[PDB]
Amino acid sequence: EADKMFFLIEKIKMFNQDIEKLVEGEEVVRENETRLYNKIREDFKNWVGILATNTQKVKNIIHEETFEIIVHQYIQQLVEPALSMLQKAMEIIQQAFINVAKKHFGEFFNLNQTVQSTIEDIKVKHTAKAENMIQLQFRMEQMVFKTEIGIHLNAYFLETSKRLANQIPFIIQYFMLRENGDSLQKAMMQILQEKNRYSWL
Amino acid sequence: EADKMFFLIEKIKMFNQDIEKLVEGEEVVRENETRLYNKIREDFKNWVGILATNTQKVKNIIHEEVEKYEKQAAKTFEIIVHQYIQQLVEPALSMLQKAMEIIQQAFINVAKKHFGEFFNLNQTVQSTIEDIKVKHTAKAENMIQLQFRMEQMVFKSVSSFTEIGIHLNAYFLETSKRLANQIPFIIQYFMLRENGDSLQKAMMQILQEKNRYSWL
């Protein structure tokens, strides 16, 4: 009956709460530290800048002067920046979740340890999901492609950059923030399944 | 040499080619019949139209709200945006259903044309076309649902109504323009490109089993 040890549940529930605050950008910070969303937007803004650069690049190219090759190239030149953006956001968020773990579970080494390993596992799953969605987007962007005409083309790329500017970051927030936070909270709850581990936690 | 039935190698080569032409919009038609790409574009244009209407509608709704609250001062919006987005799922999925029908009929007409004489062959090919159709429609539908989930979730102290109004306007602008291409992209990728490719791969896989050539 010493298993009032289910009262670790309160710990988890508190931790989970903090996680959800991070997911909704309603976290609580010092005067000497930045928000999560702001680090993330810094990353996304770098992306938009890159996009703008490459779009200016092909605009200048065609202003100087099959068609598809140029599109293929344009996108291939975006694969590295996009995935690099994914990686930087993952790191920011994983660091965030870990600081929540350190704070709530610092005293219980075993629990803190297993929680952090859970955090990593779920991170790699959702990173896989995000990368697959992004690659799918570029694939779609290429395949689905098919007298002063040039303007239309510029306009095309323009719309395209502006689409990608939000579409890739959405995919990244969805999987690395929302779906990640959700899976994490669920896994945190599912930890309690096997009961012979409570004393050890 | 009675097995000159390796002329299947040609049939498929040609059939497959024709299919790919449909995918690349370079099909060949009479003067009194229209291309596939255009039949599809009409559907997409209808979608963009629906988008434009619904988006002007919530723009007006939230402008009225912001005015109301500004006037009083001298979740409500999340609900409205959520509603706005759920209202697009049905038109989006209906557009998918309408395009599946168009493309399926197109692919069947190519099979009838190339395989009309060989009833067994035509039959198994049409069944194949159906199989690949339902699988790829499943994929497309999942992607569309995923896009809208994503749009809902990613949509989500001191504020001002002036700023909320600005932000929301910018949002509706960008979102409508995105969804305008994004839903048709999914439909083309899955119902045209991946569908056509899957079909050609299957036809290639037919040349493998030779003890069945006779039956064709």
Curated annotation (Swiss-Prot), chain A:
Inducers of expression: By type I and type III interferons.
Domain of life: Eukaryota
Localization per record: Cytoplasm; Nucleus; Nucleus, Nuclear pore complex
Stated role: Interferon-induced dynamin-like GTPase with potent antiviral activity against human immunodeficiency virus type 1 (HIV-1). Acts by targeting the viral capsid and affects the nuclear uptake and/or stability of the HIV-1 replication complex and the subsequent chromosomal integration of the proviral DNA. Exhibits antiviral activity also against simian immunodeficiency virus (SIV-mnd). May play a role in regulating nucleocytoplasmic transport and cell-cycle progression.
Similarity comment text for this entry: Belongs to the TRAFAC class dynamin-like GTPase superfamily. Dynamin/Fzo/YdjA family.
Protein name: Interferon-induced GTP-binding protein Mx2
Organism in which the protein naturally occurs: Homo sapiens (Human)
Lineage, broadest ranks: Eukaryota, Metazoa, Chordata, Craniata, Vertebrata
Gene expressing this chain: MX2
